[PDB]
Amino acid sequence: MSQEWKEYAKRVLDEWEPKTKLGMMVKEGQITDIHEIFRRGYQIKEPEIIDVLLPEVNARENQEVLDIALTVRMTDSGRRVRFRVLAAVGNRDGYVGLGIGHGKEVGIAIRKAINYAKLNIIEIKRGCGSWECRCRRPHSVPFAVEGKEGSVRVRLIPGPRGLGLVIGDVGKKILRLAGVQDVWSQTFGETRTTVNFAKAVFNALYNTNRVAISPEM
């Protein structure tokens, strides 16, 4: 797909008007490095900042919706139903944002969520090293980590090459969107609650970088 890449980013860069200083420097082409937004902890306030980094072509921002829920609030002579939805933005290339959103209509929420998710993007650091030898690519996570969300306890474990994403489907969707090829998954405590389990996996893949190791040194 090649050059059509920047063309979506530049088409967004036709009418995108920066609210922030962050949205401005990105819209100027400065610090053209998502990673160089993360390290610094500069606030992802604009959705488009990201649309600037992820073109049509290379990483392929895999937008995906997990669960759509229908909830109610009882009101005077009324039930006011709405919808909550969980969406996953991610590149197989080692970024991910988990989003949930709530709305009266369905379509909107999808949209809301898709946006919500952008803000909460995260690097997952993968295992260069692997498990055994750093033969080529980061197949796994570096270290086993666990997630914590309400009742849910997810362990990610390093792995053999080819032994790929051995988790429940819900997480399996999120992980694939991360870019972990291979990972043992040890769950504990009710997953039925999708939103959390997901929040678990996300938190988990989040905590990757939060681990402080020796090879960093």
């Binding site: 055994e132 030898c133 033969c135 053999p160 090459r161 080819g162 032994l163």
Partner: peptide
């Protein structure tokens, strides 16, 4: 020469 390529079959 690695036991890791084996796991790289499908």
């Amino acid at each position: 020469a690695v036991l890791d390529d084996v796991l790289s079959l499908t």
